[PDB]
Amino acid sequence: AGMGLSTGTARCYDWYMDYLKCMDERKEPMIALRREHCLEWLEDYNECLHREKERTRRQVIERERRAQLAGGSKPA
Amino acid sequence: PGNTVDNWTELRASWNKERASSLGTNYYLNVAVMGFAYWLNEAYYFPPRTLYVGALVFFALYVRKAYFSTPYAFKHEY
Amino acid sequence: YYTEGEIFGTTFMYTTNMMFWAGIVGAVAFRRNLIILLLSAETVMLACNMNFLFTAAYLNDITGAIMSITITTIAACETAIGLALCVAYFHMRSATDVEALNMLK
Amino acid sequence: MFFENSAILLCALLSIAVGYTKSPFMSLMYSVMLFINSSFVLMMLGFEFLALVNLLVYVGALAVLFLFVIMLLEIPATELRAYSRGWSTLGIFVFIINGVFQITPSMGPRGIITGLPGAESITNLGHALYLYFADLLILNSLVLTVALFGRFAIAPV
Amino acid sequence: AAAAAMIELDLCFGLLLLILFGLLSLRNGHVSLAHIRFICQCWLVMITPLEVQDFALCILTVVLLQSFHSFEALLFLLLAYIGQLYMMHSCNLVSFYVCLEAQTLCVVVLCGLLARGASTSFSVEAALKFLLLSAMVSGMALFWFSAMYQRTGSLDMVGQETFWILLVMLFKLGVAPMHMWSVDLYGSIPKSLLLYLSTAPKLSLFTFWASSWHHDFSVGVFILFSMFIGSIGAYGQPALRSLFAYSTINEIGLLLLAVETAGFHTLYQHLGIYIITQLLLWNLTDKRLFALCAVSLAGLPPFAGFFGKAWIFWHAMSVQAFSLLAAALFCTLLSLVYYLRVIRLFWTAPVHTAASFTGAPNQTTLTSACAVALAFAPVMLVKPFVI
Amino acid sequence: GLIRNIATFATAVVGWSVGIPFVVQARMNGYVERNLATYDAAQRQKAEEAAIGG
Amino acid sequence: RFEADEILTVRKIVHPVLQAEWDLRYLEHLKREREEEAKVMKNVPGWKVGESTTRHRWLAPLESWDKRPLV
Amino acid sequence: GWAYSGEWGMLAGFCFGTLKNVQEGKAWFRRPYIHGAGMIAGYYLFKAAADWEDEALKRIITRYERKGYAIPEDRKELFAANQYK
Amino acid sequence: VFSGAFNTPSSTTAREPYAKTKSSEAEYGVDTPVPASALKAADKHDALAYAVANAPLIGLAGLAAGAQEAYMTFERLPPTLSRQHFKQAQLLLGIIGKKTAYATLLGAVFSFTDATVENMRGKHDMTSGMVAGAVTGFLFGMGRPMPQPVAWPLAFAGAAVAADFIGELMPKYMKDYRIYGPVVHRENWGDPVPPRPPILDTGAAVRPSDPGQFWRGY
Amino acid sequence: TWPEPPNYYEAPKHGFKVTLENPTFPIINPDPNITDAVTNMRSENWGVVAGLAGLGYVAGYYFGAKVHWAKPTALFTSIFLGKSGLLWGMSDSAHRLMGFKENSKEVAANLPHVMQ
Ligand SMILES: CCCCCCCCCCCCCCCCCC(=O)O[C@@H](COC(=O)CCCCCCCCCCCCCCC)COP(=O)(O)OC[C@H](O)CO
Ligand SMILES: CCCCCCCCCCCCCCCCCCCC(=O)O[C@H](COC(=O)CCCCCCCCCCCCCC)COP(=O)(O)OCCN
């Protein structure tokens, strides 16, 4: 259920295990209360999964590159 | 009350037609629930006057499935 | 703004979403027979199977392949039983219905 | 990558085409084309064995049963109100809203994903099926047993 | 080491031996199979773990098997029991899907197989409609499981996609407005499968819900739909099969009110009393006891149905679910009218009960007379018992 | 006729293979635009919280 | 079995050399990408060149040279 | 559990036998061995229910005290008791 | 206890108000957050924005009833009418659209009249709901024979009154209701104090109106 | 990036049901075979096997006599219940050998040179 398709484990299995270890070591009587204290590991696991923030950074660099070529077309 | 011939013609009215199978109604109900019932998720937090008036509005505009008939069943053009 | 792999992935997901809703709705919408309804159910199963295999490749994970094999098994068993029931009902009701396998008429 | 993306997009066209036509034979032919094309799509993702399973089961076995049932049970009634009654506009509206515009997509808030090819290992699949998911394997066998017994009990005598 | 899995190997070995024994018995031309049924009941006891819910399901299925006579029907009921038992232990959507689909296929095949007389084609028709409606719900479950699996990367059942899985579960309980497959099934399929369908799968699915399910949503509109639609439908339908189908929709609305306000103890108490009443309802030969089912399904005070409804009402009032409670009380006031129609039909009438001619003389008087003693269970129900 | 049906199928396949990528491209462009708006709003909130949070 | 065991041993010998070569090439490509980003975003206020997204674990690229579509 | 649960079970068994006779058209006293078997089963069933009463109270107090709900010793005897009320 | 002379609880009352009862060792609530659309929909200070926030939900009911009636009309269509797809689409969309627009109109009239009387009277009470119900029901009942132009304002006002009593006034009156721990104003009876309110995994229609009633979540 | 060189000839040592415990008793054998499980089985296990077989024989004789097939029904029902009991007893013995159940009787009998 966490077994890899061509490798031993999945590519983001260890990030998931970090998150579950954080959830294991908290002592709050509710899962919803424990989740508020492990949000950094859940965020890193989601970044392993889909890379939304790396894609966002590349989109911002592309917006600046498209801005420095339309507004700026300076000839020598 | 009334006349026997006129009452029996009233009893016969709008039933001279083959009844449809129920598979279409059931499939359309399941499609409506599985596709659009998530639109009511935030409605549980709305004010209760709005929810009660909406429930009364749904009751007032409901059309009953049993003994239902349309004039469109027996006309040859729109 | 986006790469060729992102076009490929978004095209796959858009295709499978339209496949799923085509299989769910279309044969009922076009008022077709029970045989075509079972074929469209197979289209629904194919869309889910393609989604599971895409995700299994996407995560490098085995669970999508297990689900793929299971979906093929369950879909074929349900389809075979449904076709047998269709044949039995047709032979039971053809003397008075003619269009017996069409319940959307 | 024009032909690969076109082959991906062809599956949705064939999915609509299965229900669009009035001939049951042509519906089955569209389904066979769809399953062959999808087996070639699955092999873009790196799956060699599972694409062959798709072909062998659905086209090789199940569509033969479909064609036997259609050819045994379908006297031509395409004129007999299959053309003269048309289709449902409410159902077409539901299909447009949910599958063209896709107001409730499976990716949810995300709108872009990077497609990644895999590398199928059948040793990993054999290990998983016969060690880690062995109870699911046996329960799949029990479902196939239900299918075999139930068909032979329901066969019209 | 596989030493912790001997019950699974025992399940498989028992199935392998039972098929061969059933084959050998049929090669002799035996027209009755009580020995096969006893071996099936022994196999049911031998594969069930030592929990309360597991043994409740086991004893229920042992009692149900006395109304089935062919070898194939017994095999289908055993393989449906495997899905019903293992769904209570399912902690994923993989096993959830497989158990639900095994149960659906078994029910479809049994509906096809057991019909007789002029009602054969009606039963096959309703089985086909149920199969088609079940296929698309299974597709919805698979599609949204694939969505959840892609989003989370794991097999955890969290997030927005659990709303559609919840709708799948509500379909399997016949919750209005997805209720009409059960209404179609009640009108044509014979009484033994109707008895099977109203008891065992509801227990299995509610135990899965109690054991391994959380969602961040509500089911209140389906509570309202089930209670109002079931009560008004049972008030308006003159056929008795449709009366009991709509009254079942009303009861599942009450069970959903118990689920929605938490407090599963009232859910389990009402479900147990309902299951015992169902076991009485579908095995009745004397029609005077049809009035006891009526007074104990209307919630009338000294009988056990009152207690099952009244803890649901008490826990709903405890957490202040006022609007759903008011709707439940209105529909309870409506339900009394058609249960009184039942009492008018079968109590204020001359008594006629035909004798048996080909043996088997009134063959389920033991179970029906034992289940009528739901007038003595209320002494244990008033105590803190079900928690 | 057979030639008409083959021509209609070929036309439908080519039209689907040219028209749908524009739908997908428009959808992806809308997602990119909304994501960039979300990034700018997040940066604005971060600057505000740095301004009154020390 | 003897042939497979020999090939597995040789692959175990060669694997760290190849992973090291991959690592050095990846580092050089990252250096070129950071130079390009610094050339593009020099005038943007508040932008930091080289901001890693995750906090603890290194993130490999999603795509790789060895996984290609068959057809 | 309840002190008079076995007598209630015996009355349940007698009513069971009488109803099994009435359903099959026999008078109430016919087949008294059916009444006797029903009485034995009813006695043991209601004694088992009365045992589950004490068991449920013990489970509730044990779970509540492990969660941190400290019950005073004047009230722990309401739960951790095989009370024959 | 019981005598024919008098009823002692009718004259045995407290002489002072009580202090607040401590029910648990932790006195902070736990709950899931409300979505912002419903938070905005509660605001009545802008009558127009209140009607705009509330009317689409009441229009959803007419959409559901219209879709029902449209399917039931479509099923009865003969083939000579059903194959004409543009005419079929305009008939069914006419039925659905008329129902949706009528429901949205009734909802907007109710919400605007409610918030207008609210802002005009300067206070929140049950009069604004009764007046809004009378106006909306008179709009529904116009043009009909005569029990109805009186009967429909009464029905819509009764729906408003039931909404106030069940959904607002009774939860406000029972904010100090406790099912656990010490009996309120009877702490001398000695019922023990739990470490927390009870954790219940209830649905979204059953949420704690006070932080001390229960903890909601999982 | 560069994957691990796969070992085709080594399968993982995994049983599909995992116990999620550590043993709380001394471990005699972490992995006993069927001979080890039978040769350290207690007498109560054999007693419940024989009781199940006898009950199966009697009940099978009762039910098989209605179709005049009583002896083979009795034999089959006896074997069916007896193998259920035997699997139960072997599992109990193996769990005592592995340390998950109390094995004071088993530690003083299965270690002839490690007796005391
Ligand atoms: C007429 C029927 C009579 C039945 C009873 C008599 C027959 C004997 C019973 C069968 C053998 C005993 C039961 C299983 C023994 C397992 C104990 C064990 O460790 O044995 C071997 C364990 O190997 C097996 O044979 C494992 C059996 C696997 C069975 C897998 C399927 C289980 C059932 C799944 C069903 C799923 C659930 C279905 C419903 C959802 C290996 O022994 P070892 O570890 O000492 O040897 C080490 C060596 O290098 C090899 O490992
Ligand atoms: C005439 C009838 C014919 C049929 C017409 C069909 C209607 C059109 C189809 C639906 C179109 C609207 C649905 C999409 C709304 C998107 C809202 C913004 C999305 C967003 O980012 O916020 C979300 C919260 O919004 C939410 O919670 C959105 C809830 C909206 C509910 C659906 C729309 C209202 C119901 C339909 C209209 C009825 C009107 C009747 C006149 C998720 O938040 P996140 O932080 O996770 O987002 C993560 C990404 N940044």
Q: Is I186 helix (H, G, I), strand (E, B) or coil?
A: strand
Structure tokens at E39: 């071996």
CB < 8 Å to G44, chain A: 64
Q: Which of E319, E322, E323, E330 should we substitute to test contact with I (largest number of I Cβ atoms within 10 Å)?
A: E319
Compute the distance from residue D103 Cα to the ligand 2 centre, in Å.
8
**CA–CA gap between residue E66 and residue E195 (Å, rounded):** 12
Count H helices and E strands in chain B, helices first. Answer: 3, 0
Compute the distance from residue I63 Cα to the ligand 2 centre, in Å.
16
Backbone angles phi, psi at D88, to 5 degrees: -100, 125
DSSP-assigned letters across all residues of A4-73: -SSSSB-TTHHHHHHHHHHHHH---SSHHHHHTTSHHHHHHHHHHHH-HHHHHHHHHHHHHHHHHHHS--
Burial D83-108 (b: 16+ CB within 10 A, else e): eebbbbbbbbbbbebbbbebebbbbe
Compute the distance from residue E2 Cα to the ligand 1 centre, in Å.
6
Other beta carbons less than 10 A from residue G33's beta carbon = 12
Strand (E) or helix (H) holding E78: helix E71-87
Q: List, as ranges, residues 41-100 from I with C-beta within 8 Å of D.
A: 67, 70-71, 74, 79-80, 82-85, 88-89, 92-93
Structure tokens at H35: 């009444």
CB < 8 Å to D136, chain C: 66, 70
Ligand 2 touching residue D142 (CB < 6 A): no
Structure tokens at C38: 């079972």
Residue C64 C-beta-side C-alpha neighbours within 13 Å: 33
DSSP-assigned letters across all residues of E100-168: HHHHHHHHHHHHHHS--GGGHHHHHHHHHHHHHHHHHHHHHHHHHHHHHHHHHSSS---STTHHHHHHH
Residues in chain G: 71
Q: Is I199 helix (H, G, I), strand (E, B) or coil?
A: strand
Q: Which residue of E has its CA nearest to J61?
A: E35
- Residue with the two structure tokens 């439940």: E328
Closest CA to A1 of J33, F25, A9, G10: A9
- Residue with the two structure tokens 């409609």: E129
- Residue with the two structure tokens 């989370």: E152
- Is E92 in Cβ contact with A16 (below 8 Å)? no
d(CA A10, nearest CA chain J) in Å = 12
Q: How wide is the angle at C-alpha E347 spanned by C-alphas E346 and E351, nearest 5°?
A: 80
**CA–CA gap between residue E270 and residue E296 (Å, rounded):** 11
Closest CA to C101 of E108, D86, D24, D157: D24
**CA–CA gap between residue A53 and residue A45 (Å, rounded):** 12
**CA–CA gap between residue I144 and residue I121 (Å, rounded):** 32
Structure tokens at F5: 């049906």
D116 touches E at CB < 8 Å = no
CA-proximal residue: ligand 1, atom 12 (nearest): J34
- Residue with the two structure tokens 């729906």: I159
Bridge partners (DSSP) listed for residue I216: I200
Task: Give residues with Cβ within 8 angstroms of D14, minimum separation 6.
Answer: D30, D31, D33, D34, D37
Task: Give residues with Cβ within 8 angstroms of H15, minimum separation 6.
Answer: E373, E376
**CA–CA gap between residue H36 and residue H10 (Å, rounded):** 9
**CA–CA gap between residue I54 and residue I113 (Å, rounded):** 12
Structure tokens at E205: 């699915």
Closest CA to E195 of E234, E248, E132, E251: E248
Which whole-number Å values give the CA distances from E307 to E259, E304, E314, H47, in the listed order? 17, 5, 10, 21
* Gyration radius of chain B's alpha carbons: 19
CB < 8 Å to A1, chain D: 132
Structure tokens at D31: 């389904």
**CA–CA gap between residue E327 and residue E220 (Å, rounded):** 11
Sign of the Cα torsion J49, J51, J53, J59 reads negative
d(CA G35, nearest CA chain A) in Å = 13
Query: What DSSP character marks residue I200?
Result: E
Ligand 1 touching residue D139 (CB < 6 A): yes
Name the packing angle between helices E120-152 and E93-113 (round to 10°): 170
Q: Which residue of D has its CA nearest to A7?
A: D124
> DSSP H helical segments within J1-116, as ranges?
34-39, 43-64, 70-98, 104-107
Compute the distance from residue D136 Cα to the ligand 1 centre, in Å.
17
Ligand 1 touching residue E82 (CB < 6 A): yes
**CA–CA gap between residue G60 and residue C68 (Å, rounded):** 28
Beta strands in chain E (DSSP E): none
By CB neighbour count within 10 A (0-12 exposed, 13-18 middle, 19+ buried), where does E336 fall?
middle
Residue I193: what residue type?
V
Q: Which of F23, F28, F36 should we substitute to test contact with C (largest number of C Cβ atoms within 10 Å)?
A: F28
Distance, CA of E350 to chain centre: 33
DSSP-assigned letters across all residues of D63-132: HHHHHHHHHHH----IIIIITTS---HHHHHHHIIIIIS-SS-SSTT------------HHHHHHIIIII
- Is E365 in Cβ contact with H20 (below 8 Å)? yes
d(CA J50, nearest CA chain A) in Å = 42
Task: Give residues with Cβ within 8 angstroms of E283, minimum separation 6.
Answer: E67, E195, E364, E367, E368
Which whole-number Å values give the CA distances from A15 to A41, C60, E348, I146, in the listed order? 7, 14, 71, 71
* Gyration radius of chain A's alpha carbons: 20
Task: Give residues with Cβ within 8 angstroms of E269, minimum separation 6.
Answer: E307, E308, E311, E381, E385, E386
Compute the distance from residue D73 Cα to the ligand 2 centre, in Å.
46
**CA–CA gap between residue I82 and residue E340 (Å, rounded):** 45
**CA–CA gap between residue D76 and residue C95 (Å, rounded):** 17
Yes or no: say if E181 and E59 are a contact pair by the CB < 8 Å rule: no
First to last CA, chain F: 79
Other beta carbons less than 10 A from residue D68's beta carbon = 12
Q: How wide is the angle at C-alpha B58 spanned by C-alphas B54 and B63, nearest 5°?
A: 170
By CB neighbour count within 10 A (0-12 exposed, 13-18 middle, 19+ buried), where does E185 fall?
buried
Other beta carbons less than 10 A from residue E4's beta carbon = 18
Closest CA to C84 of D146, D19, D25: D146
CA-proximal residue: ligand 1, atom 41 (nearest): J33
Yes or no: say if E124 and C85 are a contact pair by the CB < 8 Å rule: yes
DSSP-assigned letters across all residues of E169-186: HHHHTT-TTS-HHHHHHH
Yes or no: say if H30 and E365 are a contact pair by the CB < 8 Å rule: no
- Is G41 in Cβ contact with A64 (below 8 Å)? yes
Yes or no: say if H60 and E384 are a contact pair by the CB < 8 Å rule: yes
Yes or no: say if E143 and E154 are a contact pair by the CB < 8 Å rule: no
Bridge partners (DSSP) listed for residue I186: I183
Closest CA to I130 of I156, I169, I104, I150: I156
- Is H71 in Cβ contact with I194 (below 8 Å)? no
Burial E79-112 (b: 16+ CB within 10 A, else e): bbbbbbbbbbebebbbbbbbbbbbbbbbbbbbbb
Q: Is F47 helix (H, G, I), strand (E, B) or coil?
A: helix
Structure tokens at A37: 């204290």
Yes or no: say if D37 and C58 are a contact pair by the CB < 8 Å rule: no
CA-proximal residue: ligand 2, atom 31 (nearest): B39
**CA–CA gap between residue E375 and residue E306 (Å, rounded):** 11
**CA–CA gap between residue E286 and residue E289 (Å, rounded):** 6
Yes or no: say if I161 and I126 are a contact pair by the CB < 8 Å rule: yes
d(CA A32, nearest CA chain I) in Å = 6
A6 touches J at CB < 8 Å = yes
Yes or no: say if G19 and J2 are a contact pair by the CB < 8 Å rule: yes
D13 touches F at CB < 8 Å = yes
Name the packing angle between helices B48-60 and I85-121 (round to 10°): 140
Yes or no: say if I191 and I175 are a contact pair by the CB < 8 Å rule: no
First to last CA, chain A: 61
**CA–CA gap between residue E45 and residue E47 (Å, rounded):** 6
Q: Which of B29, B30, B49 should we substitute to test contact with I (largest number of I Cβ atoms within 10 Å)?
A: B49
By CB neighbour count within 10 A (0-12 exposed, 13-18 middle, 19+ buried), where does H29 fall?
exposed
H25 touches I at CB < 8 Å = no
Strand (E) or helix (H) holding E344: helix E322-346
Name the packing angle between helices E200-212 and E240-260 (round to 10°): 10
Compute the distance from residue F8 Cα to the ligand 2 centre, in Å.
38
Query: What DSSP character marks residue H77?
Result: T
Chains sharing 3 or more CB pairs under 8 A with chain E: A, B, C, D, H, I, J
**CA–CA gap between residue D142 and residue E139 (Å, rounded):** 21
**CA–CA gap between residue F32 and residue A61 (Å, rounded):** 13
**CA–CA gap between residue H47 and residue H54 (Å, rounded):** 11
Task: Give residues with Cβ within 8 angstroms of E259, minimum separation 6.
Answer: E206, E209, E219, E267, I203
Q: How wide is the angle at C-alpha A45 spanned by C-alphas E152 and F33, nearest 5°?
A: 75
Solving technique: cryo-EM
Backbone angles phi, psi at D121, to 5 degrees: -115, 120
Yes or no: say if D107 and E150 are a contact pair by the CB < 8 Å rule: yes
Q: Which residue of D has its CA nearest to E108?
A: D150
Query: What DSSP character marks residue E262?
Result: -
Q: Which residue of A has its CA nearest to J16?
A: A1
**CA–CA gap between residue E80 and residue E101 (Å, rounded):** 10
Structure tokens at B21: 């199978």
Strand (E) or helix (H) holding I215: strand I215-216
**CA–CA gap between residue B59 and residue B53 (Å, rounded):** 10
Other beta carbons less than 10 A from residue C13's beta carbon = 23
Other beta carbons less than 10 A from residue I120's beta carbon = 10
Strand (E) or helix (H) holding I216: strand I215-216
Residue I133 C-beta-side C-alpha neighbours within 13 Å: 26
- Is D135 in Cβ contact with E94 (below 8 Å)? no
Count H helices and E strands in chain C, helices first. Answer: 3, 0
Bridge partners (DSSP) listed for residue A9: A3
Phi-psi label, residue J68: left if phi above 0, alpha if psi -120 to 50, beta otherwise? left
**CA–CA gap between residue I47 and residue I52 (Å, rounded):** 9
- Residue with the two structure tokens 């094995």: J103
**CA–CA gap between residue C19 and residue E139 (Å, rounded):** 12
Q: Is B69 helix (H, G, I), strand (E, B) or coil?
A: coil
Could you say which of A10, A59, A62 has the minimum Cβ distance to residue C59? A10
d(CA E208, nearest CA chain A) in Å = 19
Structure tokens at C78: 């349900």
Bridging pattern class, strands I199-200 and I215-216: parallel
Sign of the Cα torsion J5, J9, J15, J21 reads negative
- Mutating to test ligand 2, I would choose from B31, B38, B39 the residue with most ligand atoms within 8 A of its C-beta, which is B39
Yes or no: say if H71 and H61 are a contact pair by the CB < 8 Å rule: yes
Task: Give residues with Cβ within 8 angstroms of C17, minimum separation 6.
Answer: D99, D102, D105, D106
Structure tokens at D124: 């990993």
Query: What DSSP character marks residue D58?
Result: I
Ligand 1 touching residue J104 (CB < 6 A): no
Structure tokens at D152: 């032979």
